[PDB]
Design an enzyme around this catalytic site. Structure first.
Site, PDB file in Angstrom:
ATOM      1  N   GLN B  86      19.495  44.184  28.488  1.00 15.45           N
ATOM      2  CA  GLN B  86      18.862  44.483  27.113  1.00 15.45           C
ATOM      3  C   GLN B  86      17.838  43.746  26.978  1.00 15.45           C
ATOM      4  O   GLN B  86      17.165  42.853  27.554  1.00 15.45           O
ATOM      5  CB  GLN B  86      19.844  44.014  26.175  1.00 15.45           C
ATOM      6  CG  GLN B  86      21.236  45.208  26.121  1.00 15.45           C
ATOM      7  CD  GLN B  86      22.334  44.873  24.920  1.00 15.45           C
ATOM      8  OE1 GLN B  86      21.970  43.726  24.240  1.00 15.45           O
ATOM      9  NE2 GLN B  86      23.149  45.489  25.204  1.00 15.45           N
ATOM     10  N   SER B  94      30.371  44.840  27.803  1.00 11.87           N
ATOM     11  CA  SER B  94      29.862  45.957  26.744  1.00 11.87           C
ATOM     12  C   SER B  94      31.012  46.991  26.822  1.00 11.87           C
ATOM     13  O   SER B  94      31.257  47.464  27.823  1.00 11.87           O
ATOM     14  CB  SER B  94      28.629  46.271  27.123  1.00 11.87           C
ATOM     15  OG  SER B  94      28.482  47.579  26.273  1.00 11.87           O
ATOM     16  N   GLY B  95      31.803  47.112  25.755  1.00 11.21           N
ATOM     17  CA  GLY B  95      32.621  48.284  25.838  1.00 11.21           C
ATOM     18  C   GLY B  95      31.934  49.875  25.887  1.00 11.21           C
ATOM     19  O   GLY B  95      32.186  50.500  26.742  1.00 11.21           O
ATOM     20  N   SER B  96      30.835  50.189  25.088  1.00  8.07           N
ATOM     21  CA  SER B  96      30.278  51.164  25.149  1.00  8.07           C
ATOM     22  C   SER B  96      29.609  51.323  26.499  1.00  8.07           C
ATOM     23  O   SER B  96      29.647  52.542  26.969  1.00  8.07           O
ATOM     24  CB  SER B  96      29.303  51.286  23.888  1.00  8.07           C
ATOM     25  OG  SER B  96      28.082  50.385  24.415  1.00  8.07           O
ATOM     26  N   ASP B 252      24.113  48.316  16.819  1.00  7.98           N
ATOM     27  CA  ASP B 252      24.902  49.175  17.731  1.00  7.98           C
ATOM     28  C   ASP B 252      25.231  50.434  16.744  1.00  7.98           C
ATOM     29  O   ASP B 252      25.746  50.433  15.775  1.00  7.98           O
ATOM     30  CB  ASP B 252      26.110  48.335  18.041  1.00  7.98           C
ATOM     31  CG  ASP B 252      27.047  49.183  18.977  1.00  7.98           C
ATOM     32  OD1 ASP B 252      26.586  50.054  19.632  1.00  7.98           O
ATOM     33  OD2 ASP B 252      28.000  47.943  19.674  1.00  7.98           O
ATOM     34  N   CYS B 256      31.485  49.229  18.748  1.00 11.18           N
ATOM     35  CA  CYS B 256      31.381  47.864  19.341  1.00 11.18           C
ATOM     36  C   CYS B 256      32.722  47.696  20.150  1.00 11.18           C
ATOM     37  O   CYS B 256      33.568  46.966  19.586  1.00 11.18           O
ATOM     38  CB  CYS B 256      30.828  46.877  18.582  1.00 11.18           C
ATOM     39  SG  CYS B 256      30.360  45.321  19.648  1.00 11.18           S
ATOM     40  N   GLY B 257      32.704  47.778  21.539  1.00  9.47           N
ATOM     41  CA  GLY B 257      34.018  47.196  22.148  1.00  9.47           C
ATOM     42  C   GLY B 257      34.300  45.882  22.080  1.00  9.47           C
ATOM     43  O   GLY B 257      35.410  45.310  22.113  1.00  9.47           O
ATOM     44  N   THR B 258      33.178  45.224  22.645  1.00  8.41           N
ATOM     45  CA  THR B 258      33.408  43.666  22.692  1.00  8.41           C
ATOM     46  C   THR B 258      33.577  43.097  21.281  1.00  8.41           C
ATOM     47  O   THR B 258      34.177  41.976  21.264  1.00  8.41           O
ATOM     48  CB  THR B 258      32.341  43.118  23.459  1.00  8.41           C
ATOM     49  OG1 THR B 258      30.925  43.244  22.903  1.00  8.41           O
ATOM     50  CG2 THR B 258      32.201  43.477  25.204  1.00  8.41           C
TER      51      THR B 258
HETATM   52  O1  LIG Z   1      30.440  48.119  22.891  1.00  5.05           O
HETATM   53  C1  LIG Z   1      29.974  46.921  23.066  1.00  5.05           C
HETATM   54  O2  LIG Z   1      30.583  46.181  23.357  1.00  5.05           O
HETATM   55  C2  LIG Z   1      28.522  47.030  22.925  1.00  5.05           C
HETATM   56  C3  LIG Z   1      27.871  45.630  22.577  1.00  5.05           C
HETATM   57  C4  LIG Z   1      26.418  46.240  23.021  1.00  5.05           C
HETATM   58  O3  LIG Z   1      26.479  46.116  24.279  1.00  5.05           O
HETATM   59  C5  LIG Z   1      26.545  47.400  22.461  1.00  5.05           C
HETATM   60  N1  LIG Z   1      27.803  47.922  22.102  1.00  5.05           N
END
Ligand SMILES: O=C(O)[C@@H]1C[C@@H](O)CN1
Lengths: 342, 347
Positions: B86, B94-96, B252, B256-258
């Site tokens: 990034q 990162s989840g996504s 985002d 946001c997965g994390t």
């Molecule tokens: O889904 C996630 O964890 C991430 C955090 C960033 O990379 C953007 N979405």
């Protein structure tokens, strides 16, 4: 079965300003002339849909244009193109004309001759002659002969809350500009003021277009003030520019069309004559050479024939599937700007 | 020498609107004996910054989206490894982007797609992420991730602010570290109209919180700092509404997965979820994930949770980048207009 229908784009930038060139898979755009094609793109819902697919998220980003390569309708032209941005489709662009020339030559769609190749591009504004200096399959420089450029209104005024009375010129350089001496805003054209210049440029664009309607006197498809370009002169004489573009960003290039519109004002004011040239610099310090080739008239008024010299750099190739639960295209104000909320 | 350098091939994918390009060709060797060492190298060595800037700043990159660098697996249990690039730094998790990577690997056939289900084991600097992909007719329709053990660093921290008074927040880990902030404290809700305000607030808080506390994963020295401030709320129907803010200043597009993982650790600590539970999470654009609590574990001898994150990826193109010896902007650049005020500091 997906990925059955792909659009192929060459990724090019001209002095920092992205001009993706769509070379394969471009759909047929209705219209008997390129100007009619421009009109259709800007008025038909299917043209809006096509533009949004290509220029909004997730396929597009706030920076860069998508140039649709289209069949030449004029027998003198090697190809035609129209410029797609998040605000509208536009008739003309110096940086993007250089990107298209660069792309047509470096892809082999047009025969590359050395040391020089002439490419005649057809736009909704007229034919743009592009003279490329070529070396070893590389297009090193491109000089454009831009469409006849003219003054619409010199020394216009508009009241504003933040700066008081703002003087500006309305002029045509392939699209219409409001040209604003930046020192009036107490700002300089430098990277640290980019956000402030964008906010000012958008305020002014919105106000000016509410107050006055501008149209090309011979070409109904070209209308509205496209951009507000802030201008200054550097200590060494260069024209410093910052073209602001809706929904809120700056041109990375010195701006070919904006320089053409400004050249028309310089000639009206007695400050240039044919054979003169000078440098123009953008907010990031990238450079074009701007020339005055000669004079003509448009619909009865004096006009200039500008030349714009700069360089294009190909940096990649994209294939985009034309055939998603979001899909249409979207924006958010975070990076697209406050005005994007529309 | 050679005219052309850094010739790389990437699949264009997004997960619930959040772009994760996946580098599938021309990826160079990244020094390091482990994937965590590779992450450290990317974040410390000048050549690591050069590579990242090449891939993520203009003209090749744009303010939105990540580039996922696929790397050779170093754990024999993993099918592939990756690190997220990034404009701020390289990140461990990162989840996504894990869903993008899974989707890209399967849909391209780089990993053979089994139907109805394919399990892809992804190695990250944070550990192994199990991705279970529901696959049908050549397409990866959804992915459920088993995220790395997530935990609370500090509950109910506070910080004084000019605009909002005392802001209460949790510091928690869900693959990277978050400051988790109830959005109502700003007098705002998470909706598109507030995007610019949320970004400004998130950037201010990220900067202040990081100058005040240093956070490092207790087992993984390469994972340090508060990566993001995620604003959070609860929708009438019980869904967790999120807005993760990302330097130098954007949100985002996914739930946001994390960040949901970090938030889940705080929910468990507050007695509000138990293993087996699940709930929806929604982003600022209304895209959705399903968040589950699979089970409990420990990190550093203290309670931790095992989150699941379910979402969909969509492959929409492919591209190639290269570095032309002639190009004076081969290094990458930004401007504050669309990257944010904070972008002025990127040297
Ligand atoms: O889904 C996630 O964890 C991430 C955090 C960033 O990379 C953007 N979405």
């Amino acid at each position: 079965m997906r990925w059955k229908r792909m659009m192929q784009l060459l990724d090019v930038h001209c002095e920092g300003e992205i001009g993706k060139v769509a070379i394969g898979g471009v759909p047929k755009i209705p219209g008997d002339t390129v100007a009619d094609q421009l009109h259709w793109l800007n008025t038909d819902p299917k043209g809006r849909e096509l533009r949004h697919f290509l220029v909004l998220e997730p396929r597009g980003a706030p920076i860069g244009s998508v140039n649709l390569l289209l069949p030449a309708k004029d027998s003198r032209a090697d190809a035609a193109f129209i410029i797609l941005q998040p605000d509208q489709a536009h008739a003309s662009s110096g940086s993007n004309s250089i990107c298209v020339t660069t792309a047509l030559l470096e892809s082999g769609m047009i025969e590359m001759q050395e040391p020089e190749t002439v490419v005649m591009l057809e736009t909704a504004a007229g034919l743009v002659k592009a003279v490329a200096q070529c070396r070893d399959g590389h297009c090193d420089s491109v000089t454009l002969t831009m469409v006849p450029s003219f003054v619409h209104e010199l020394d216009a005024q508009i009241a504003t809350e933040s700066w008081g009375e703002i003087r500006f010129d309305l002029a045509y350089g392939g699209v219409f500009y409001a040209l604003v001496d930046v020192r009036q805003l107490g700002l300089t054209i430098e990277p640290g003021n980019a956000r402030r210049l964008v906010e000012a440029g958008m305020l002014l664009k919105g106000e000016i277009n509410q107050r006055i309607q501008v149209v090309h006197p011979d070409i109904p498809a070209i209308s509205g003030v496209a951009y507000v370009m802030f201008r200054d002169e550097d200590p060494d004489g260069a024209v410093r520019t910052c073209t602001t573009m809706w929904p809120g960003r700056v041109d990375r290039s010195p701006c070919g069309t904006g320089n053409s519109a400004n050249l028309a004002t310089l000639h009206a004011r007695g400050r240039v004559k044919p054979g003169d040239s000078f440098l123009s610099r953008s907010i990031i310090g990238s450079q074009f050479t701007v020339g005055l080739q000669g004079l003509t008239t448009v619909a009865g008024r004096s006009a200039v024939i500008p030349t714009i010299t700069g360089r294009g750099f190909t940096y990649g190739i994209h294939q985009v599937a034309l055939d998603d639960p979001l899909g249409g295209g979207f924006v958010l104000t975070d990076v697209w700007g406050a005005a994007a909320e529309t």
